[PDB]
Amino acid sequence: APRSVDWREKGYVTPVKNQGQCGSCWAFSATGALEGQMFRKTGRLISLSEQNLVDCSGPQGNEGCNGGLMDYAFQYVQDNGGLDSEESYPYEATEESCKYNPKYSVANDTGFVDIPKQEKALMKAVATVGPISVAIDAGHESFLFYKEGIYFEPDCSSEDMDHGVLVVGYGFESNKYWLVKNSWGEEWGMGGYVKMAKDRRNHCGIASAASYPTV
């Protein structure tokens, strides 16, 4: 696999979004992975609706602003037969009644793939598939106050990941890291991104809940 990978360079990634004060990170991680796979297939990058997922994927197991899973979001898109665009179904940072309208559906999926729980496997998926949805342990002050550099929290756990994010690549500094897109706005970290420690024993559990949709 390549020494460095950055899908942002190829047009697979939308600008950084902001989930605000709502536990919908799983929806932002899911739209991020879908935006990438839809792009790989059609050559068109279209921002997708996190609100649609928040309001309508309860049957699949999600709990709107009180939590969810990226895999549940992917299953919803398949079950539902579509997912609306961000433009057609704006984000409100609060759960509301389902307003899905197939007329504005711009993405879909025929299943999803759960990646083996090894950084090596995550690296191959990132190198061959595109941006990958993952969960990390962001349960620490240091993550909330992060601004720059390779994030490495000594107290990180590879078993209690509590925050869904998107791996858009990986690289090394002149020391290895995963390039991660967060959903906390562009004023957090590096324009909304964080360089998470790579090949440091699955630091913060980055490889333990990695998946992507098949479109």
Residue closer to ligand NSY by CB (options 25, 197) is 25
Residue position matching structure tokens 């993405």 = 107
**Contact positions toward ligand NSY, by CB under 6 A?**
19, 21-23, 25-26, 61-63, 66-70, 135, 138-141, 144, 160-164, 209
Residue tagged active-site, from 156, 182, 202, 204? 182
Closest separation in Å from C-beta 155 to ligand NSY: 11
C-alpha torsion angle, residues 213, 110, 54, 186 (rounded to 10): 30
Binding residue per annotation — 162?
yes
Residue tagged active-site, from 163, 202, 203, 204? 163
Binding residue per annotation — 9?
yes
Look up 22 and say whether it is catalytic. Answer: no
Kindly report the number of other CB atoms within 10 A of residue 143's CB atom: 22
Nearest CA among 65, 99, 69 for reference residue 84: 99
Kindly report the number of other CB atoms within 10 A of residue 54's CB atom: 30
Closest separation in Å from C-beta 19 to ligand NSY: 6
Look up 56 and say whether it is catalytic. Answer: no
Look up 163 and say whether it is catalytic. Answer: yes
Backbone phi, psi, residue 12, to 5°: -85, -5
Residues 7 and 13: beta-carbon distance below 8 Å: yes
Binding residue per annotation — 6?
no
The Cα 55–Cα 138 span in angstroms is 25
Binding residue per annotation — 96?
yes
User: Binding site for Zn(2+): which residues?
Assistant: 9, 50, 71, 86, 92, 96, 114, 137, 140, 160, 162
Active site residues: 25, 163, 182
